[PDB]
Design an enzyme around this catalytic site. Sequence first.
Site, mmCIF file in Angstrom:
data_model
loop_
_atom_site.group_PDB
_atom_site.id
_atom_site.type_symbol
_atom_site.label_atom_id
_atom_site.label_comp_id
_atom_site.label_asym_id
_atom_site.label_seq_id
_atom_site.Cartn_x
_atom_site.Cartn_y
_atom_site.Cartn_z
ATOM 1 N N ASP A 107 46.014 14.516 26.098
ATOM 2 C CA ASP A 107 46.534 15.827 26.626
ATOM 3 C C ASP A 107 46.638 15.760 28.253
ATOM 4 O O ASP A 107 45.715 15.307 28.864
ATOM 5 C CB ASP A 107 45.608 17.040 26.200
ATOM 6 C CG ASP A 107 46.104 18.035 26.489
ATOM 7 O OD1 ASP A 107 47.122 18.599 26.275
ATOM 8 O OD2 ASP A 107 45.321 18.836 27.484
ATOM 9 N N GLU A 118 50.577 12.606 27.083
ATOM 10 C CA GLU A 118 51.406 13.561 27.273
ATOM 11 C C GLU A 118 51.808 13.698 28.601
ATOM 12 O O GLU A 118 51.039 14.044 29.598
ATOM 13 C CB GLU A 118 50.964 14.962 26.804
ATOM 14 C CG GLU A 118 51.843 15.988 26.968
ATOM 15 C CD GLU A 118 51.197 17.643 27.428
ATOM 16 O OE1 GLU A 118 50.122 17.512 27.901
ATOM 17 O OE2 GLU A 118 51.744 18.499 27.072
HETATM 18 CL CL LIG Z 1 52.390 16.428 22.808
#
Ligand SMILES: [Cl-]
Length: 471
Positions: free
Chosen positions: A185, A222
């Site tokens: 993330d 990401e």
């Molecule tokens: Cl994602």
Amino acid sequence: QKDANFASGRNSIVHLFEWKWNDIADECERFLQPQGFGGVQISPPNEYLVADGRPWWERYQPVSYIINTRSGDESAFTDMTRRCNDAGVRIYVDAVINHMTGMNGVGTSGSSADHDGMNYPAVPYGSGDFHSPCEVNNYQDADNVRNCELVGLRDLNQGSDYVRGVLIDYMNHMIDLGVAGFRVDAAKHMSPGDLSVIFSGLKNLNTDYGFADGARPFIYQEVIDLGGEAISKNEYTGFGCVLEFQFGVSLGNAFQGGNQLKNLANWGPEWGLLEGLDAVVFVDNHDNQRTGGSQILTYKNPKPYKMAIAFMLAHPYGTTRIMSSFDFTDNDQGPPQDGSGNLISPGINDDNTCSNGYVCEHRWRQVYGMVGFRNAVEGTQVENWWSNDDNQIAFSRGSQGFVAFTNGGDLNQNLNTGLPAGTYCDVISGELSGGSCTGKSVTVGDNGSADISLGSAEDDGVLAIHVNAKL
Ligand SMILES: [Cl-]
Ligand SMILES: [Ca+2]
């Protein structure tokens, strides 16, 4: 780091957004395994903030690394990894390691989250473990993006040996429990330098869960990069895959008529995308299905959405991920819950769809049919490309599968499918069941040619046939 570690004959990762560990374990056995899916990306499994109304976003505000959330505890988690891995379905953890909370509160396991004093006792983290407070407000300034707080979320200093150790211990603990890799993330908000050290410290996958010897955890990051910013997705490809966001924007635009399908002939790096081996692709994700803007296709615009997914699954480019959503009308809305805030499990209806407010896109015939297609065409390249120089395209994957699309007009053409002679069940409109096709069928002649007809007014704008759904 770039090998998904899928079991043989499997493909795609399904994001079972907000699902509980017990339910995922059941899903692995009853559906994912039989349908040939390769893995599941789970929602953050570590203790996160309990926010008013229990929105989906509370999961992105870590309080500690204790495995106890609304999805379940550690024993539920291990039951899931044991059962999914035994069913040949890998588990990928959503690792939220850029920050802690953006406000004071308590976590799902009762731990204290002191945003104000930057104290997270359950880890423990103190003010010295965070970057000095500042706001991320300039994407043309890489250090601002990486060293400041993203929307008030206390920003961890991964440059610290202490912090690195804590993160490594957390991820290694996950590996011990049988996970296959991690969705990292907010990777854009961290330094590639720190990330490489952290990732290098991860142990090989646990062979007790069926992984091959020497297997390395799959890393997909990401990095929202739509160009014109100080940070580039290319900065992260050295130590793992990167989630390709340009992919969904470009396809979403194209399948919505913002571009002619004939232009997809050179789909790939030429469109400004990463090289396929470095990319994890998807049409929509949990974030952009809410705030992605008009270019993003979601379950709310079914026809072009399924076409985009079919193109993704039919094309050899990248490792594919499929979103599985809960129905929502409000962007802050959390998943289905009871009066005590406990998650309501998806139920399976008599038609194999989900009840209780779950969309279960992965259970759509057009979606799992295409996962089947991707498995049948493994190892092939795109061949027999055809287009009407407008919005009708078709191509084969070697001599193992054939797909056709129309986003304009009826497609009625005799095309070289490159497939062996025989009757094939279109896996979009139906499937091979009991020795017959439940939907449309296509008869391929000796010369691989076939009369393809796909009307623009049909429920779907794609037709797909492969050697594993042949009469
Ligand atoms: Cl994602
Ligand atoms: Ca940061």
